[PDB]
C-alpha cells in the first residue's frame, strides 16, 4: 500500500477538485 497510498494521495486530491464542485455549488445557488 506505495502505489495504495500514492491511490488514496491522488483519492484525496481529485475529493480537492469535489470540494472546489461544491466552490463553483455555492457560487450555482449566485
Ligand atoms: C478527475 C479524477 C481523476 C482521478 C486521478 C487518480 C488516478 C491515479 C492514477 C494512478 C497512477 C499510477 C502510476 C503508477 C505508480 C507506480 N508506483 C506507485 C509503483 C511507483
**Nearest-angstrom CA–CA distance, 13 and 7:** 10
Instruction: Give ∠ CA 19-1-10 in degrees, rounded to 5.
Output: 25
In the numeric block, the cell 464542485 is attached to 21
Length of the chain: 30
| Ligand 1 neighbour 28 (Cβ under 6 A) | no
Ligand 1, closest atom to CA 7? 8
CA atoms within 13 A on the CB side of 20: 6
| DSSP state string for the chain | -HHHHHHHHHHHHHHHHHHHHHHHHHHHH-
Quote the number of domains for the chain. 1
* Residue 28 structural domain: 1-30
**Nearest-angstrom CA–CA distance, 26 and 4:** 33
| Ligand 1 neighbour 16 (Cβ under 6 A) | no
Ligand 1, closest atom to CA 10? 6
Amino acid at each position: 500500500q506505495x502505489e495504495x497510498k500514492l491511490x488514496e494521495x491522488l483519492x484525496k486530491l481529485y475529493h480537492x477538485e469535489x470540494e472546489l464542485x461544491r466552490x463553483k455549488x455555492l457560487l450555482x445557488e449566485x
